[PDB]
Amino acid sequence: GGGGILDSMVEKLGKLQYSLDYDFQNNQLLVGIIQAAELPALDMGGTSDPYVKVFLLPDKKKKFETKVHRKTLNPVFNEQFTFKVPYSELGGKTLVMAVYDFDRFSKHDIIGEFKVPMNTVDFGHVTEEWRDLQSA
Numbered sequence: 001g002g003g004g005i006l007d008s009m010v011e012k013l014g015k016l017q018y019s020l021d022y023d024f025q026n027n028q029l030l031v032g033i034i035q036a037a038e039l040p041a042l043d044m045g046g047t048s049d050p051y052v053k054v055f056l057l058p059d060k061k062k063k064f065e066t067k068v069h070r071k072t073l074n075p076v077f078n079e080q081f082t083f084k085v086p087y088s089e090l091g092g093k094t095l096v097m098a099v100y101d102f103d104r105f106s107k108h109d110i111i112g113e114f115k116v117p118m119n120t121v122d123f124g125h126v127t128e129e130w131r132d133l134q135s136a
Contacts, residue, residue: 012038013111013134014036014073015131016033016035016036016052016114016130017037017130018032018034019032019126020095020121020126020128021126027085027086028082028085029082029090030082031054031080031081031082031083032078033081033097034078035078036052036074036099037073037074038073039099039111047072049069049071049072049103050072050075050099050101050102051066052066052099052100053096055095055096056085056096059093090118091118093118095115095116097115098110099133112132112133112134113134113136114133
């Protein structure tokens, strides 16, 4: 501080709105990747090409991904994903949502991410919230 304290604050890397609900009838976790807001601008007044990867840890299965939305810092994804996992095995896992900037010719930069531990989720009601993207 003062600079040290400022440096510790959460950087403005945008926010993601998502929903989550466990379907006890079909025994699957339903995830809605709704929209992102205020993604950071690129240099020289440019915008990113955001998409979201959605997956469970420690599961090593291939991560799900939304479609890529071109040149926008405020994408509306409106996509749903399903994870076939019996409830009893869900409490030890962690749902990860990570927003990337698509590029055809170079490694895709990560914009930010956040994690939702299953043991923190309120099972029985649909979850819906905005989460600030965390650095790496």
